[PDB]
């Protein structure tokens, strides 16, 4: 049940204990490198619900990215660029997911769950050999992670008419001229 | 007559068979397929392991045929199985 207790504790973020822990940690992360490996995940409940397993082949990488805007706004998220940078560092791995760990007033801190596709344990285990398949190369660069889906608006409804099943593909389908044989 | 006026009364012919269906001039292939489906097939009955057989044999050699005592016995029935289960296994073992 410790996972659920931690879930509630992470829901309460400005509580005294969580705030103290987040402060001391942002100091630690800022003293460390911008992109560096995490062994144990800092928020094990979030990692577990996002798909992290204590197997050989799962790694965490924590990354800090500068916050703000370009008055222009970047269409992808700070989490998306953090995922892309982590993947570019660990090119031989596949970015499974990412989650928020700390904010700070200058940066923003994420931990990225990555899976090694060439590991025998990962290849033997199902439910992850899909990411062993080659169609899943650089999901973070193609927008196939959760942040990518959120930014692409892959939701169903009348509020997502232009963006589900591909915005540009929908635009082409609406602006192509169809001429049949018998007109 | 539909006393309750329920539409599924002129439709009839809470557990049902789960792995098959109790199902009830014309082309050659159709008759061939029908007889191929209707042909009588062997069932290949399942055996009980040697240890299971000797377990049941010890149970009977101690208590005889009193399934309540056979179920309540702790030394000979470590797994605390029910009298109905033990009776079914005895019948399928063929020794009552």
């Amino acid at each position: 049940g410790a996972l659920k207790y931690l879930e509630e504790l992470s829901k309460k973020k400005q509580s005294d204990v969580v705030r103290f822990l987040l402060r001391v940690r942002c100091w630690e992360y800022r003293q460390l490198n911008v992109i560096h490996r995490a062994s144990r995940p800092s928020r094990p409940d979030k990692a577990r619900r996002l798909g992290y397993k204590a197997k050989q082949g799962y790694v965490i990488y924590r990354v800090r990215v500068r916050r703000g805007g370009r008055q222009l706004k970047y269409q992808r998220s700070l989490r998306a660029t953090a995922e892309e940078r982590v993947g570019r560092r660990c090119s031989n791995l596949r970015v499974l997911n990412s989650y928020w760990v700390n904010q700070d007033s200058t940066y923003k801190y994420y931990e990225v769950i990555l899976v090694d596709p060439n590991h025998k344990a990962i290849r033997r285990d199902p439910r992850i050999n899909w990411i062993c398949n080659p169609v899943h190369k650089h999901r973070e660069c193609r927008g196939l992670t959760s942040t990518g889906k959120k930014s692409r608006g892959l939701n169903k409804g009348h509020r997502f008419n232009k963006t589900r099943a591909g915005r540009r593909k929908t635009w082409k389908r609406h602006n192509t001229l169809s001429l049949w044989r018998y007109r | 007559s539909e006393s309750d006026a329920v539409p599924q009364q002129q439709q009839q012919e809470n557990h049902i068979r789960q792995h098959d269906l109790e199902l009830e001039s014309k082309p050659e292939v159709l008759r061939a397929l029908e007889r191929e489906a209707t042909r009588p097939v062997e069932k290949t009955v399942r055996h009980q392991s040697e240890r299971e057989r000797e377990w049941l044999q010890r149970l009977v050699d101690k208590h005889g045929d009193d399934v309540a005592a056979m179920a309540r016995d702790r030394k000979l029935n470590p797994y605390q199985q029910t009298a109905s289960d033990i009776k079914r296994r005895l019948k399928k073992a063929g020794l009552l």
Binding site: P126, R127 | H19, L30, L33, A37
Partner: peptide
């Protein structure tokens, strides 16, 4: 394949059937 999928396919596989005309 997963063990649960293996069990499901073992006990409920695709059956051969024909439908009359």
């Amino acid at each position: 394949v997963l063990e649960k999928t293996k069990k499901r396919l073992t006990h409920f596989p695709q059956r051969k059937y024909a439908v009359k005309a």
